[PDB]
Paper text:
While LLY shares a number of characteristics typical of CDCs, it has a unique 162 amino acid N-terminal domain. Glycan array experiments revealed that LLY was highly selective for the difucosylated glycans Lewis y (Ley) and Lewis b (Leb) antigens.
The structures of the LLYlecwt-Ley and LLYlecY62H-Ley superimpose very closely, with a rms deviation of the alpha carbon atoms of 0.1 Å. A third metal ion binding site is observed in the mutant structure and we have tentatively identified it as a Mg2+ ion binding site due to the very high concentrations of this ion in the crystallization buffer. The Mg2+ ion is bound between the carboxylate of Asp97 and the side-chain carbonyl of Gln54 and four water molecules, all arranged in octahedral geometry around the metal ion. The water structure is the same as in LLYlecwt-Ley apart from a water molecule that is positioned between the hydroxyl group of Tyr62 and fucose 1 (Fuc 1). This water molecule is shifted by 1.4 Å toward the NE2 of His62 in the mutant structure, compared to wild-type, to optimize its interaction with the His side-chain. LLYlecY62H forms the same 19 van der Waals interactions with Ley compared to the wild-type protein: 15 with Fuc 1, 1 with Gal, 2 with GlcNAc, and 1 with Fuc 2. The B-factor of Ley is 53.5 Å2 in the mutant (overall B-factor of protein is 29 Å2), compared to 38.2 Å2 in the wild-type protein (overall B-factor of protein complex is 21 Å2). Overall, there is no net change in the number of potential hydrogen binding and van der Waals interactions between wild-type and mutant Ley complexes. In the LLYlecY62H-Ley complex, there was no additional bond formation between the Lewis antigen and His62, only a shift of a water molecule toward the His, as compared to its position relative to Tyr62 in the wild-type. The mutation causes an overall 2.5-fold decrease in the lectin domain’s affinity for Ley and doubles its affinity for Leb over the wild-type domain.
Author numbering: 41 to 184
Write the structure that this text describes.
């Protein structure tokens, strides 16, 4: 949890999520556009379901120091991103780190710092019932 590199290594990587609704493709959270208005097409959306999740494959194991989430901003539904974990997984898809968050507290973004963790996947997992996961962008930075 000290300095991080400036390059967003999640941009343009393979992304996936638990389901897709309202056209909100998982790749919208790694398209290099943090615009949080759903109508501008750069925010993801899963079904309303239990324990929705979204993941990016960094494509190799990297030493991750920071993951920045940008929430949806339009429609007074920003609170759907609450009671969730940010998880780092190794190449074998085992958990190597996990942090839980109750809220973003109305902030547009959350910066999550990891202590130099070697991981290939970054996952956001909701812990709530019957709630869709929408992210405008997830950016990931290596430890410096
Ligand atoms: C009609 C269509 O093509 N899609 C609508 C959704 O409307 C589109 O996307 C919205 C976010 C706006 O950009 C809207 O102008 C656009 O037509 C529609 O979403 C609701 O749309 C109303 C306006 O009609 C409000 O914007 C509302 O906040 C939207 O609902 C929210 O966003 C959705 C994507 C879901 O997450 C809802 O649960 C939210 O409450 C959806 C609305 O059900 O229906 C499509 O037909
Ligand atoms: Ca985006
Ligand atoms: Mg507009
Ligand atoms: Mg893959």
């Amino acid at each position: 949890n000290r300095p991080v590199e400036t390059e967003n290594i999640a941009r343009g990587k393979q992304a996936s999520q638990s389901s897709t609704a309202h056209g909100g493709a998982a790749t919208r959270a790694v398209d290099g556009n943090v615009d949080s208005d759903y109508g501008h097409h750069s925010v993801t959306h899963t079904n309303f379901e239990d324990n929705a999740w979204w993941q990016v494959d960094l494509g190799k194991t990297e030493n991750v120091g920071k993951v920045k989430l940008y929430n949806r901003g339009d429609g007074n539904v920003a609170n759907r991103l609450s009671n969730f974990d940010v998880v780092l997984l190794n190449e074998a898809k085992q958990e190597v780190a996990r942090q839980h968050f109750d809220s973003l507290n109305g902030k547009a973004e959350l910066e999550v710092f990891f202590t130099a963790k070697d991981a290939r996947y970054v996952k956001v997992e909701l812990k709530t019932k019957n709630t869709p996961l929408s992210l405008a962008e997830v950016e990931v930075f290596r430890s410096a």
